[PDB]
Paper text:
Therefore, to further investigate the role of hydrogen atoms in stabilization of the flavin cofactor during redox catalysis by COx we have determined the neutron structure of a H/D-exchanged crystal of COx (H/D-COx) to 2.2 Å resolution. A single H/D-exchanged crystal of COx was used to collect both neutron and X-ray diffraction data and joint X-ray and neutron refinement of the H/D-COx structure was carried out to 2.2 Å resolution. No significant structural differences were found between the current X-ray/Neutron structure and previously determined X-ray structures of COx. Two deuterium atoms, one involved in a conserved hydrogen bond between Gly120-NH and FAD-N5 and one involved in a hydrogen bond between the conserved water molecule, Wat541, and the proposed base (Glu361) in the substrate oxidation reaction, were clearly observed in the nuclear difference density maps and provide insight into both substrate binding and hydride transfer events in COx. The neutron structure of COx reveals an intriguing conserved interaction between the amide nitrogen atom of Gly120 and N5 of the FAD cofactor resulting in an elongated main chain N-H bond length. Modeling this scenario with partial occupancies of H/D also confirmed highly occupied deuterium and resulted in residual density between the modeled H/D positions. These observations indicating the nuclear density is the result of an elongated N-D bond rather than an average of partially occupied deuterium atoms on both Gly120 and FAD-N5. The three deuterium atoms of the Lys225 side chain are clearly visible in the nuclear density maps indicating that this group has a positive charge and that the ammonium group of the side chain is statically positioned in the structure due to the interaction with the carbonyl oxygen atom of the peptide bond between Asn119 and Gly120.
Cholesterol oxidase (COx) (E.C 1.1.3.6) is a flavoenzyme catalysing the oxidation and isomerisation of cholesterol through a hydride transfer mechanism from the substrate to the FAD reactive center (N5) resulting in reduction of the FAD cofactor. The Type I COx is a member of the Glucose-Methanol-Choline (GMC) oxidoreductase family, members of which share a similar active site architecture despite catalysing different biochemical reactions. Density functional theory calculations also carried out as part of this study suggest that a conserved hydrogen bond from the main chain nitrogen atom of Gly120 to the FAD-N5 atom facilitates hydride transfer by re-arrangement of the lone pair of electrons on N5. One subset of flavoenzymes are the oxidoreductases which catalyse the dehydrogenation of their substrate and require oxygen for reoxidizing the reduced flavin cofactor.
Numbering used by the authors: 9 to 506
């Protein structure tokens, strides 16, 4: 049937969009391919933890996997599973694996909560057509407030055993002249204090994060989505995957949608039409829908920039072996609190998250997720034989990112007399993981594939709202930028078009 506005997905862009449409009085349907995560599972919990993965962990796989960095300790808990509509999807392309959330809330379900604004000078470099003053004065602060961003208590941080691993890295970086910064989060740090005291059920302190948090983490279902549902104007349909998009003869849109059950069985194929169509299926999901629509002839007026400009936010993982006298602790919070900020907009920039190790025993390992400035981009191309978008990206395109990361961590190794670990990421002796992405960005870049407010070129009433808009890099963990850009864009769209 017909609904005035449809939003595809329930991630950050989509959640912003639906809230503001509902507040404006526009009846809005959200379609989400994954589940609503609100039913206790066989252990009485909604989500599985990292030490007890089960079918809830994974989107349609037949075996659980250890989180990157932790194979040596966590492979022992892996098991065969039934393919199921689980929360974390590892999407494998030829030379890149991308990790995305699937469910009501999208990646907010599975992310580490780190809520960081990009440096203004870099924002200006990457999106020169956007007025940066309005972003920093108005839309970033709106995003932070709505997301429920909060700050750790620094006294507690200094004292607690749960953050020893971060203190050890801050000291080691300090020896090399590098500074650290506290990073705000959407996990409730007050709640975390109470976990540590044994006062409330543990989540961050019970090795939960990448398959969801049973407590503590203010994912989008608690914030934007709850507010959107509260307008009375927004409905969410789950286990509904949009496959195709076409323009009806009179300028509306019609979608073909598959309804599945949690075992992946096709129940129904539906057609939904609308006046206003907002894509929030993420960098991979929105880009695939649009490249399919262009190359199969259902949206023939899309431009040649659709599919282009993809980058993995310079994501590289590395690890250092500590001296025996510098243990990182058997108890490590799952929510990072500190980063190393060596980002000066030069080619050697790095912002590195100090990541926890989920092993629950002393490993002496310090793990980092580095964000680098690497100009290489990939392209999504449509494969008509398999009806999938394929990412044209090769491992050598990450060389600049590896070199930048290596230069930084070599400085820290030299100052402290430590070495890398080479055995954390599988078979090869490899100190730098260069074939994964947690922060996919691009494919439908703002100002190139769309206008400067995400209106897709060639079409009216067709909008993209999500990480596909960002040109491959933001220099920090990206969800606050996505959220703020969506706030900026939807405000304009609703005032001018709706
Ligand atoms: C392990 C991990 C850790 C991370 N940590 C951080 C962090 O601490 N801070 C940070 O800033 N970022 C982090 N990220 C990245 C962050 O989660 C993403 O950048 C963000 O979620 C992107 O938002 P989005 O709105 O573009 O899309 P997504 O959040 O990816 O949401 C898209 C949604 O659309 C649905 N969908 C897709 N295709 C279709 C379709 N055809 N039909 C219907 N529904 C569809 C999806 O199932 C999903 O729910 C992390 C990501 C991962 C995986």
């Amino acid at each position: 049937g017909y609904v005035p506005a449809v939003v595809i997905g329930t991630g950050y862009g989509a959640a912003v969009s639906a809230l503001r449409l509902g507040e404006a009085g526009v009846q809005t349907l959200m379609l989400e391919m994954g589940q609503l995560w609100n039913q206790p599972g066989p252990d009485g919990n909604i989500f599985c933890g990292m030490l007890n993965p089960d079918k809830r962990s994974s989107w349609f796989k037949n075996r659980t996997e250890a989180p990157l960095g932790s194979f040596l300790w966590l492979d022992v808990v892996n098991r065969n599973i039934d393919p199921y509509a689980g929360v974390l999807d590892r999407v494998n392309y030829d030379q890149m694996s991308v990790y995305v959330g699937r469910g009501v809330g999208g990646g907010s379900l599975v992310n580490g909560g780190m809520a960081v604004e990009p440096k203004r000078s870099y924002f200006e470099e990457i999106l020169p057509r956007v007025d940066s003053s309005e972003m920093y004065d108005r839309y970033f602060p709106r995003a932070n407030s709505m997301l429920r961003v909060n700050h750790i208590d620094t006294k507690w941080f200094e004292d607690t055993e749960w953050y020893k691993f971060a203190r050890v890295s801050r000291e080691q970086a300090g020896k090399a002249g590098l500074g650290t910064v506290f990073v705000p989060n959407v996990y409730d740090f007050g709640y975390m204090q109470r976990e540590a005291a044994g006062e409330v059920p543990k989540s961050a302190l019970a090795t939960e994060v990448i398959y969801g948090n049973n407590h503590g983490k203010q994912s989008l279902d608690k914030t934007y989505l709850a507010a959107a549902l509260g307008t009375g104007k927004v409905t969410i349909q789950t286990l509904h995957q949009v496959k195709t998009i076409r323009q009806t003869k009179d300028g509306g849109y019609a979608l073909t949608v598959e309804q599945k059950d949690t075992d992946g069985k096709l129940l129904a194929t539906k057609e939904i039409s609308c006046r206003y169509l907002f894509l929030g299926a993420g960098s991979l999901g929105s880009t695939e829908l649009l490249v399919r629509a262009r190359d199969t002839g259902t949206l023939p007026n899309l431009n040649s920039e659709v599919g282009a400009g993809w980058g993995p936010n310079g994501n590289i993982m590395t690890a250092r072996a500590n001296h025996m006298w510098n243990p990182t602790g058997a108890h490590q919070s799952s929510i990072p609190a500190l980063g190393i900020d060596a980002w000066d907009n030069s080619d050697s920039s790095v912002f590195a998250e100090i990541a926890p190790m989920p092993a629950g025993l002393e490993t002496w390992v310090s793990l980092y997720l580095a964000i680098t400035k690497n100009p290489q981009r990939g392209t999504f191309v449509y494969d008509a034989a398999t009806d999938r978008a394929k990412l044209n990206w090769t491992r050598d395109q990450n060389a600049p990112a590896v070199n930048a990361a290596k230069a930084l961590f070599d400085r820290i190794n030299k100052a402290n007399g430590t070495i890398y670990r080479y055995d954390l990421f599988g078979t090869q002796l490899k100190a730098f993981a260069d074939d994964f992405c947690y922060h996919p960005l691009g494919g439908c870049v703002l100002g190139k594939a769309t206008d400067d407010y995400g209106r897709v070129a060639g079409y009216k009433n067709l909008y993209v709202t999500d990480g596909s808009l960002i040109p491959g890099s933001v220099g920090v963990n990206p969800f606050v930028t996505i959220t703020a850009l969506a706030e900026r864009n939807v405000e304009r769209i609703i005032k001018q078009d709706v």
